[PDB]
Design a protein around this ligand. Sequence first.
Ligand SMILES: [Ca+2]
Ligand SMILES: [Ca+2]
Ligand SMILES: [Ca+2]
Ligand SMILES: [Ca+2]
Lengths: 308, 308, 308, 308
Amino acid sequence: KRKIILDCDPGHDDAIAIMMAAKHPAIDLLGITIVAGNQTLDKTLINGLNVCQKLEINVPVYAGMPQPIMRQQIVADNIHGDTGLDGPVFEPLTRQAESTHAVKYIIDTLMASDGDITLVPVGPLSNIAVAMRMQPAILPKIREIVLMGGAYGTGNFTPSAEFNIFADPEAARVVFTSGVPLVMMGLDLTNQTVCTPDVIARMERAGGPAGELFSDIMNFTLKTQFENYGLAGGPVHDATCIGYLINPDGIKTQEMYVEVDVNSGPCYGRTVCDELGVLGKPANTKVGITIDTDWFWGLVEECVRGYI
Amino acid sequence: KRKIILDCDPGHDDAIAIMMAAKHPAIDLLGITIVAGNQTLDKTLINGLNVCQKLEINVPVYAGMPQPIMRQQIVADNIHGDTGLDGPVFEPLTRQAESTHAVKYIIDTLMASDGDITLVPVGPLSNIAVAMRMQPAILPKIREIVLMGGAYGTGNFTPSAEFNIFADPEAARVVFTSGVPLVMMGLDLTNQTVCTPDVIARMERAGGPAGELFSDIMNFTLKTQFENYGLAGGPVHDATCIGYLINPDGIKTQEMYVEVDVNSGPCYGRTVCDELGVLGKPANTKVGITIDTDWFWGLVEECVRGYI
Amino acid sequence: KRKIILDCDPGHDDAIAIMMAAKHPAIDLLGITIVAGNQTLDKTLINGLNVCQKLEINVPVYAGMPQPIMRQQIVADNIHGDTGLDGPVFEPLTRQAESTHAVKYIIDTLMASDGDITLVPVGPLSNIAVAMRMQPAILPKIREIVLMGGAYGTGNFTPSAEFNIFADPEAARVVFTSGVPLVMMGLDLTNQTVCTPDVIARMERAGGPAGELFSDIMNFTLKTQFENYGLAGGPVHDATCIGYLINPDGIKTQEMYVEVDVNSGPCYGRTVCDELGVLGKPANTKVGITIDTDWFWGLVEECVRGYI
Amino acid sequence: KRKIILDCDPGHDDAIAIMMAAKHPAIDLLGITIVAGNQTLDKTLINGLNVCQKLEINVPVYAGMPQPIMRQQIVADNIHGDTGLDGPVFEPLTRQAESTHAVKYIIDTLMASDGDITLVPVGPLSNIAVAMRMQPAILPKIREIVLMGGAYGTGNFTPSAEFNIFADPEAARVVFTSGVPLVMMGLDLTNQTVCTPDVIARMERAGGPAGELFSDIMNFTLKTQFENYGLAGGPVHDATCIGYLINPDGIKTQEMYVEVDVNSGPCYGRTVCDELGVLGKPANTKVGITIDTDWFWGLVEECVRGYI
Ligand SMILES: [Ca+2]
Ligand SMILES: [Ca+2]
Ligand SMILES: [Ca+2]
Ligand SMILES: [Ca+2]
């Protein structure tokens, strides 16, 4: 099993990632850490807890950074709605976050570990960067980082930048210069996972708590992702990181030297990816290129069925 | 006919553009202006003159800027050789450049015109930017600018930037903020025109001075373009601008808001292209997307046969 | 009494600041927080504890950030020596740091307070920035921040930047946009406190533990500050913040709009101070202009005598 | 005699510089080149011509760049008025610009020379930068550049930048990296030349065409320089360059390594001056520190009296 800490900002696709991570036998989900991103932390926290309660997921949830490390905070309410998880309606929330701050949880867990834990950040990298600079000794302890973020081609939130990186470019600069093994599921790969109405229907047919939740969630971003970016369905970007850890053969990556641009201006938060190797620098990232969607959606269905 | 001034840094594909522009009846080639780029100006001027002499092109050639407007000069000898036009071997040069500087030629020609002239820049944009800032009254007199440069995806000389723009980002910023009708044949489009051995063979069979010249030229970049960028043949990037003016239906463009990034750093000289229209700014550029290569190679052959 | 938290990177002048803050009856020193700066944290922590043990200061010391929030770490060993506090030799260390992290201490103390605590950063601003972004609710709780850092004219570490800001420009950007009442003792003011041989001799004559310590400390930077910068003596930069809080009439400030430049390049970490108000923006900082050095050295001697 | 070409954007103090340069026997004024700056070129050219006609100065005037090389044009109408030279009255213009563009004039004159000509730029550096990049062979021909621009301390138009540099930072970058001997009369020096009401009265008493002109001109900026920058009189910044060439002993300079910041942001167009030599780079500029104003105003009076 791959031990993971899932760091997220739920978030529609974050919820699908949580659903898969908490169920699949190849993943050992140690804890969920929450960061500000898609919405403010008060909301992404409530959203994370709501998902865990509904799916009866037995994993502690820790609240982290409510703001990025330097920049003026942005949100993605255009895609995710005022709540950050518009669509599903939950019973009154009874579970709460742990007392320990996510940054402390991340540091303490890594330091006490035998170096076998993978971090899976699928929101802005704020928690990760603060942990890395607060306790540099965590670096040798990180097995790998499999993050959803970035784009080698076109961004979403700006032409140059994908949201997670754009929401905290300085934190991304920290992570991308950490020297830790990195896998980047960028938009070039993740936009392939558009969740069209026939995919939603497939998960509805499977049914149960996860099938119902999948439908209520993914129907919302069907509209917003089309209206904003022209996508044929809402991608489940964040779930690709979980897929990658369950079976990396389903995903083609290419090793590249990647740099995060922190210049104010038209490329702030861009992941500059040396696809042709022209800079002659050692690769630092496995960059996602293609995903086998037949495999991927089969895996999603299998996880959904696990909750029946 | 479309009247043009062809501004170039020959340069293998520049030579092919010259060959096409000077021959096709849909183009009225008024003058050739030369800029430093692929090689230093002493070399690109000699290369331009050698090509015109070989093909008996009786169009005046004017020498322009030997250095970019602000940055430290770069060259592309890795692609184009120490001469800037390795491959063909020419007879002793008898023609000479005009005494009028290219910048003065461009300004004077536009100022005296009926507003029907198109600028076709296929090197760094140094001559164009100096002309625009030296005599801003040319702007309302320019019909269109159809330039080869930029990339909405991956660059060549760097991951972020295409060579022409990279060689003078500040000049490019001038041109891209000019407000003049702009067409951009960037690498995304032009990399489709890889001149593979079968395409060279085709032009060899057409024969004559242009067919032989085509072969001697494009066989050289066949090797360097593969070594540097993995390309299956050397693209004839600059010739796409001439093709566009001959028949724009052969090339699909998309209107986009494009900005040139002049920040020192990993995106210096990037053309940032808003493919999805997320910035909510009006388009300023028709950006090349796809080219019909059957049409394009047919047109190249037609022009080649014109010199028989 | 003004309640303070002293955040520092000892550091020769930090030690003088600690000596004054812990002894003057107008200061209520709640706690000392340590940051990486002049040297790595393992060292500035040891230096801070050494000074507290030597002078029998019974204030808790908390260790904070070992690295800046984003940039590559720099140190000032050129000025401060290999240990960070070259000069004095101390008896074996028995004094211990608290187990609580400085960031958590800062946040909890502020949150539990009645808004009457002043922060006094005299190192890089890493601890402060992390606290502000980790718990934004601390902002209304901060009475004032009186920091040593920046320069409106010439920097030290670079022509543009003073060391504390240069060592963490991104953290400084956080602090200077916080909206909290701000006082900046910059180099323009603090270079006025050159500790010349006659000043040292004055403190030697006062004697006792603090007088010996002052001599052993300030004799070191006497040499390093002259060799590296213009300086006739080592300034006691950080002690000016303590002086300011004891009697602000001893220092002339001017209210200015101040911005921290985070651009890579020749002004990275510059504090841009709008001396003439040309930007038309509301002031956010009281910037130090002149200090009454007779008043100041008198105050130092008084504090030194307090340890006899 | 020192042969000069005076490149300017008249401009109140430019006019005083022209008056001195054309009269003092220590200067051989070859030509006046005009650039856009204080106002658009149409206005600065008329202003320059008006001054020459009024004072019967028989020196050719050449019109140059009407826009900076890259940035969006700014003007200083707040200081110089809508005309760029509000204050004096002129008879109908009979004088006109020469037919040769200033950039060509500068190049041709330098290339034909024995290397003994000094350039005296007292506006934005647009003409100079275009000349340097258009014909790099001019570099060794330039004896010295004595420019009015920059500031090692506080700017005027912004806190970071002096107007001439700010109006074309990219051109200034070109000039400051040229390797030509450079003297920089920056604001730190030139602000010492405030033309208070008693100085104006002194020149009125001298009388003649130049005394009357001096008064009409300097009474205008007396008002604007006070309102904008709090200055006690309008400085005659540009005239200090002519003073420097008449008797350099009247001015104290310090050799420094100077870099022009071309970063967009709060230091765009700053001259970063390494006062303390901390960068370990060889000096490239003699930076003005102080001027003997008793000497200087005596020289101004002597020049004024020359026109009686
Ligand atoms: Ca997410
Ligand atoms: Ca070319
Ligand atoms: Ca300190
Ligand atoms: Ca001027």
